[PDB]
Symmetry: C6
Subunit: 267 residues, 6 copies
Amino acid sequence: NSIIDLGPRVQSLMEQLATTKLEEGVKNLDMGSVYEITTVMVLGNSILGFHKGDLVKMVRPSVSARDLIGVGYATASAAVVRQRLIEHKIEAGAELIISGTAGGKTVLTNHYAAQMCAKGLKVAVVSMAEAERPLYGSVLHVFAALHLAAVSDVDVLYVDSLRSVYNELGGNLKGVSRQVDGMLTALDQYARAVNMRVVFTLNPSDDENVDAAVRSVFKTASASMHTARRIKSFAVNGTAFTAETEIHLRADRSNSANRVSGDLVSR
Amino acid sequence: NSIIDLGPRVQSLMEQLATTKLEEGVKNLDMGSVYEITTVMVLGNSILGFHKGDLVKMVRPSVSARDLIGVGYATASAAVVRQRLIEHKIEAGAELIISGTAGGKTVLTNHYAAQMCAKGLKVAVVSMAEAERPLYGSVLHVFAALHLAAVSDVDVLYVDSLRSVYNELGGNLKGVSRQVDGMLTALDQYARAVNMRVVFTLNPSDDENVDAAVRSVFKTASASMHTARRIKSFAVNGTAFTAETEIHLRADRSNSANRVSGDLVSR
Amino acid sequence: NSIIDLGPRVQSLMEQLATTKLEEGVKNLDMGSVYEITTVMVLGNSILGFHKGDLVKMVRPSVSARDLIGVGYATASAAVVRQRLIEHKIEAGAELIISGTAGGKTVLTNHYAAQMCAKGLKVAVVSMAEAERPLYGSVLHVFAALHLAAVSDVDVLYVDSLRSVYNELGGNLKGVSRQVDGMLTALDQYARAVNMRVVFTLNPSDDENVDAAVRSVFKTASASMHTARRIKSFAVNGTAFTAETEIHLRADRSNSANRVSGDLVSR
Amino acid sequence: NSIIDLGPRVQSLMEQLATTKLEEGVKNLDMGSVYEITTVMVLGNSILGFHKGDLVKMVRPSVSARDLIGVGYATASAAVVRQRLIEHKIEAGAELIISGTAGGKTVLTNHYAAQMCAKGLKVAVVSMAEAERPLYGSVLHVFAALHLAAVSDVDVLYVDSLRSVYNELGGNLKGVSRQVDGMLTALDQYARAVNMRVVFTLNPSDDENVDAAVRSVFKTASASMHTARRIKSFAVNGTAFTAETEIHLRADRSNSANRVSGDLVSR
Amino acid sequence: NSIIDLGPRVQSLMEQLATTKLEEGVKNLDMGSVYEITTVMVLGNSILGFHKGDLVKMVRPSVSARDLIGVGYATASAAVVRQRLIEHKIEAGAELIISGTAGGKTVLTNHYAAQMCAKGLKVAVVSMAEAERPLYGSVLHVFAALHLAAVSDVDVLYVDSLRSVYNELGGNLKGVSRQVDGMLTALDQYARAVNMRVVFTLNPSDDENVDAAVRSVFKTASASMHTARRIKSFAVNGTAFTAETEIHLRADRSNSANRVSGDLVSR
Amino acid sequence: NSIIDLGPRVQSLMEQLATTKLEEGVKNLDMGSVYEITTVMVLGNSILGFHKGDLVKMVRPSVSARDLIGVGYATASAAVVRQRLIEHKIEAGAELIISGTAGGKTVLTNHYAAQMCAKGLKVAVVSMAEAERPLYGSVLHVFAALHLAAVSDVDVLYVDSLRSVYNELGGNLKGVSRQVDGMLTALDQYARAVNMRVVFTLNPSDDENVDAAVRSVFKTASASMHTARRIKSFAVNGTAFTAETEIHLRADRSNSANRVSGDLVSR
């Protein structure tokens, strides 16, 4: 068992999606057939639909897709079940790992990814909106990665990070918090509909007050997502790391301190 | 007797409304035939009309719909009368439940909805613009929910919340208060025309000064709507709640303090 | 003799004007044939003309209607004379009733309207841009109400209020005062051309400094219109009211204090 | 001999110019044939030309008229000479009468117009951008007045006022002073080309600091125009007036104080 | 020998360029055939090319002209050599004469132009963006004048002034300094390519802090152009003038004080 | 061996790219055939592709190129390997030379370019966004130069400077840092894909706080690029220079002080 990098698959799909006629649709793709899922997202005022593993079609409705849908959603077949999540007692939904001046969000993601892979889960990782990463990290890249993972034999998906999406929704401008709330709620709703555990990461480094943005996004994520994790402290001792974290679980409303340490895992 | 959740019906209608030709119209719908009501709303510069339970058509008039209509209205036959509202002495119109840092607007909504259901009224609830809720809560979702309840056998409708509409009208930007006034008035005028009691909720949590926004929206709602209720204090004691509230009744201009307590009712 | 509510007639005309082809014109209307009047108004860069009681047509001129006309005017045959205004010695032109934190502009309007009706004048009232009022109060609604009254047997018309028009012209933003001046002058010019007495009301409640906006609009109205009335104080004693007012008469340039009291008249 | 009011002639021309096909041209007009003059003006990015007394045509050039022309000019035959200006030793060019909080610009205009009429000159007056005046006072209204006076037997033209043009050019916003400079230079250049004396008036009453705007526009007009006159003080004693004025003559660069008094002349 | 005024030639070319089909081109012009030069400039997102003395054509490229070219340039055969500049040891390039509150930029320009004319050079002057000057002074007028002087037997060109271009590039707004830098570099690059000495003048009189704008434009011009001259002091004694100036020479990086006096030369 | 100036080749390509039909493509170019590389960039919402040495075609996809790609990339055959970089142990990737008030970025670039040329590498230099340089320095000019150097026999490329790109991405406005991050990452990713060493230079001289902009861009470049070099001090002693520099190496995370001195090398 090993961790799958979904990055190149998103990159090749984006090349195929660079058509002048997406309204006609792009057929004969091989996105995946393990699960029957339909991903419907809003791009501007238009709707972009990912139908199973074969079709991707854009529609321009008479009324804006913003008024119609808002952000996006998933519809799954009644047969869709990720058995390995049940066996290892991992609940479907989205999780957020947020950090500020302390950092260590990528180090923690790699730690949790390797931990799940060692446990027996089929783990996928997609790197975006960060240095040394080819994917820019737009809302399209997030929904394309979510869909590619959903229709595939992927139990846990790691999206590192939402930096570009946060910027796209005006997060670095201080109407803004509503759009971030909407995105976070849609991502948790998606991971539930698709029966997958999605872990998203964010470091609002482009913001004026980085730690104040962390505190507000953490409060938002605490209500909108299954799990919200804030890195308070982070330090590296050669090949090992240690991080002082604050975790919120929506289920029991609890806010507890958790110390997480381990070795540096490469990606 | 039980409370009806209109959310899934709004969601299915939005899927049907995702057409490239809304100018041609979407026929053979089954929105309801209890009351002959036509809902006319403005979407940008265009008009969206909900004709009885069968048709939904968009028109793009030569002059902007903003200059023509403004927000939206309802037209009905002289036979549109809700007998249960007369029997239980409940006046038609819109009501607002507003809260700030105290919260408890959803808990109060569920309390009043269960109270009306126990009284013998046909109660419908629609959830939107909040965490864990599928509906985004756009102006379209509010008018679609209003129309579905209007043409159906619904005496009282609860819309929780107007958070997205408030944001859409620039409420979180500080010309703004005029658009909020216009919406609130149109919502009361609608409920009177349709002869239904509609209860709207709002928590301006996306605003910079949340409690200052509550005080100004409460003053606006006091004139624009039949009743305006402000939650001053709210606390939960296990399975029970207690809320210190301020209520304004437009009929006698009175502003009185009201203590409301009960058990936590799920949705 | 009784007061005519022009509101429903404006509402039905707006429904007929919701066409995709206003350039072709909307014929066979029955707006009125007592006086041969043509109302020309500017809507954006386009011209909207109300020809007698039969036609309403939109033209999109090569040069903007803003440069061509500005706001709007009325053209009438030499036979347009309202005999009842001569008999009761009432001069044609527009008058403004402005109030701030004191309020009572609607109460004063109803008082003066009932006073004119009792005198023997054919009085019409149009309610817009206010709570419990179906008409939004756009510039179109103002010009439609003016035209409907002008072509009919109406001696005095009351427009309560100009709140939406004031907002539309950027009055609540602080180039703005020029557009308000232009509107006020056009309305006085219209009433004189049409030989009708028109009484407009305004409460800049959407403004940051409401009483400072009242003082500046009152100074503008003092030059732009026949009469300008400012409510300084207003109080209700059961079924009776009393208001301390400041009135400006353009004819003698005089600014005098006037106490006006009476009973509460419903609309 | 009497003063001509050009206002109604500008108003009727604007009605004729309200065509959907100004690119095709509006022929068979009777603007005037005393002098062969062509007026070229810029309206947005388009060019509007007034050819003698017969044609008015709009052209939409490939490059913006702002880059091509800027504001506007006049072309005339070598025979354009106003003999009465030579006989009474009056030089061609534009003159500005500016006032602030002191007022009296209209009273002074009427005083100078009556003085020129009594001298033996053919005087024309156009009232615009002010209370009790039908013309809005756009750049179109100014150029149409200039052209009607130029092609006709008019020695001196009084334009009261440039309030709307000043506002149109962003004068009440504080790039702005360049557009005001450009207009003032174009108006003096026009009057010289057409061999007519044109007197313009301005009161920047829509400006935040009215007297500071007067001081800067007066400094600009001192260089851009033949003469610039600033009203420092103004008072009315029954039927008589007295004004303390500051006049700048471009010819000798001199800035001198001038006391002007007389009787109130109606328009 | 005498100084040539290029103003009327630029004015007549602009009249010929007022076509609806500049994409087709304006042929059979007689701009000049002394030197084979092509002037390419950017107008918005479009390209305007002046080909030798015969053609002027506009192209609308698929990608913006801003990304493609930036400002504008000149292409010429190496046979473009102005022998009189070699004989009188004058280097090709652009020169800036900048003044603030002191003034005297026009007086200095006329002084230097008469000095060069007396030396034996073919001198041309173009007056724009100033009072009593028909040319508005847009970027088009600057490039048209440069091209008309470049293809003709002109050794030294004087462009008084760049006031409108400075305003057009947002110079009077405080991204702005980059556009001014780009223009100044393109103008020096042009003069070098065309092998002509061009002297530009500027007085940022439309700026809030005129002398602070002079200091920053002088620093920019010191790097961007061959020579930058700042008028520190200026006074007129009847028919004579004296100016205290600061000159920067790019060649030796030196910044020295220079006193320049002479008689007032008319234009 | 000598240094190649790619500037004129970029200039000629831009002239060929000034077509109205870039969607049809511009064929039969001779950009280079040493390496099979395709450069894909985003221009607004459109995609501009440089296919090997023959084609350049623009596509306007249904969804924005911003959501699809973001900035731009390079695709190459497995045979794309620059043997001289292996022989001289030089790693592929982008490097940044940043300076503020100290200057000397061009002097250092010329020093390093001559040093690499003397070593035996095929060195190319492209001058843009600076005084005395014909290329404006847009994102198009950067990618055109990148592609032209990529498909050719060029081991090391010097791009002096990114001043215009920094301005284009809103770098001089204080959402901005995300776009600068994205560009810097894309350029490093490009250089790695194309297997070339690219050295970029930047002096944020158009910024309000130049040295504060240097400190933040240096921190960004430290993560986004292979190497980041900051000029702390710089002085010229006749024909020799000396610069106190701070260098960051991404490989070992180290931040060390480096003194670099040499002779002034012309370009």
